[PDB]
């Protein structure tokens, strides 16, 4: 686990990893969330090119259409929105908790 990557970069690796915890529907979710998006003004996901798509075709989907950190976010920043807090927090927790610590 730990000392895998003394010099490393993710970005794809990452994005996988997590997207390999979404189930059928997890990724069914996610990949209309974002993918017939109007709230991302026309969406980068071609018409219905995601249906058969798993969590190896998406991680590849979102990288080439988004990039490598964009489609880490479009991933993270979805699974609270498809009710995938548990690993939406695994994503971000970002700075600070309260006051002082974090």
């Given at each position: 686990?730990?000392?895998?990557?003394?010099?490393?970069?993710?970005?794809?690796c990452?994005?996988?990893?997590?997207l390999?915890?979404?189930?059928?529907?997890?990724?069914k979710?996610?990949?209309?969330?974002?993918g017939?998006?109007?709230?991302?003004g026309?969406?980068?996901?071609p018409?219905?090119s995601?249906?058969?798509?798993?969590?190896?075709?998406?991680?590849?989907?979102?990288?080439?259409?988004?990039?490598?950190?964009?489609?880490?976010?479009?991933?993270?920043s979805t699974?609270?929105?498809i009710?995938?807090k548990?690993?939406?927090?695994?994503?971000?927790?970002?700075?600070?908790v309260?006051d002082?610590?974090?």
């Amino acid at each position: 686990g730990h000392m895998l990557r003394t010099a490393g970069r993710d970005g794809l690796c990452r994005l996988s990893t997590y997207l390999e915890e979404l189930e059928a529907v997890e990724l069914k979710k996610f990949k209309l969330y974002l993918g017939t998006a109007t709230e991302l003004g026309e969406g980068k996901i071609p018409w219905g090119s995601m249906e058969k798509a798993g969590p190896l075709e998406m991680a590849q989907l979102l990288i080439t259409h988004f990039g490598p950190e964009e489609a880490w976010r479009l991933a993270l920043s979805t699974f609270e929105r498809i009710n995938r807090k548990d690993l939406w927090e695994r994503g971000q927790r970002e700075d600070l908790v309260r006051d002082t610590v974090e």
